[PDB]
Structure formats: structure tokens, C-alpha cells
Amino acid sequence: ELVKDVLNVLIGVVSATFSLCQPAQAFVVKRGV
């Protein structure tokens, strides 16, 4: 079900992210911890 997001993550999509930012500090990928 969550995979649907991954499919469009191949295209650019925001459910996951490539924040144009400092690695980790603001740079990020949507994740569950």
C-alpha cells in the first residue's frame, strides 16, 4: 500500500524527500523511526 508512494518516488514526489539542505540537519528523506 505504501509502495504506491515509492512508485512515484521514481518520478519526483514529496511523500519521500531530497531536501536541498545540509546533510541530515535539513537535508532529509521521509522515514519512520
Binding site: 512515484n8 519526483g12 514526489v13 514529496v14 511523500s15
Partner: protein, 100 residues
């Protein structure tokens, strides 16, 4: 908009003095420029409470209208039209993913 009216006349005077053999160079009635309809461009449910794959149908519906120049319910065509750059305003509350 108002500034354009000058350029058209200044150019007209140049061809009138240059050629007096051909007289009364043609001009179009004032309403041709004044009427805004002739040129192409000119109950709302809260989208925040909707399920996701319904917003897509709505946003698709509004965009289909924007392409031909007619305003849409969830996306508005900003009327600044300042300089020559047209800008558009999408509803603030949408899914960031759909919005981009």
C-alpha cells in the same frame, strides 16, 4: 495597458507624413481594445477535509479549465499581469505532493 495606447498612435503619424498619396490609413474602433472579453484571458467544498484520490480529480478538473484561459474553483489566475509575466495562485490547503 494604458501605456500601449501611445505607441500605436506615434507609429501611425510616421506613415501618414511619409505617404500623402494613400490617405486615411485604417484604424480599428476603440471598443476592439477596450472590450476585455474578445482577448482570451480574464459552495466551494473545503478541500482539506477530502480523501486523496478525490482531490486529484478536482485539481485535474480545475487545470483542464486553466489551460484554455478560464479561471478555476481551486486554482486562480493572478490579475497583476505586471511587466509581461503571468502568475497563478493554487489553494493553500492541498497535499504538498499534489500541489508541486
Amino acid at each position: 495597458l494604458q501605456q500601449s495606447l501611445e505607441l500605436k498612435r506615434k507609429m501611425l503619424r510616421d506613415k501618414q507624413n511619409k505617404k500623402n498619396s494613400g490617405q486615411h490609413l485604417p484604424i480599428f474602433p476603440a471598443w476592439v481594445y477596450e472590450r476585455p472579453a474578445l482577448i482570451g484571458d480574464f459552495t466551494a467544498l473545503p478541500i482539506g477535509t477530502l480523501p486523496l484520490a478525490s482531490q486529484e480529480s478536482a485539481v485535474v478538473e480545475d487545470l483542464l479549465y486553466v489551460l484554455v484561459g478560464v479561471d478555476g474553483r481551486y486554482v486562480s489566475a493572478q490579475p497583476l499581469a505586471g511587466r509581461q509575466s503571468r502568475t497563478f495562485l493554487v489553494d493553500p490547503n492541498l497535499d504538498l505532493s499534489i500541489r508541486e
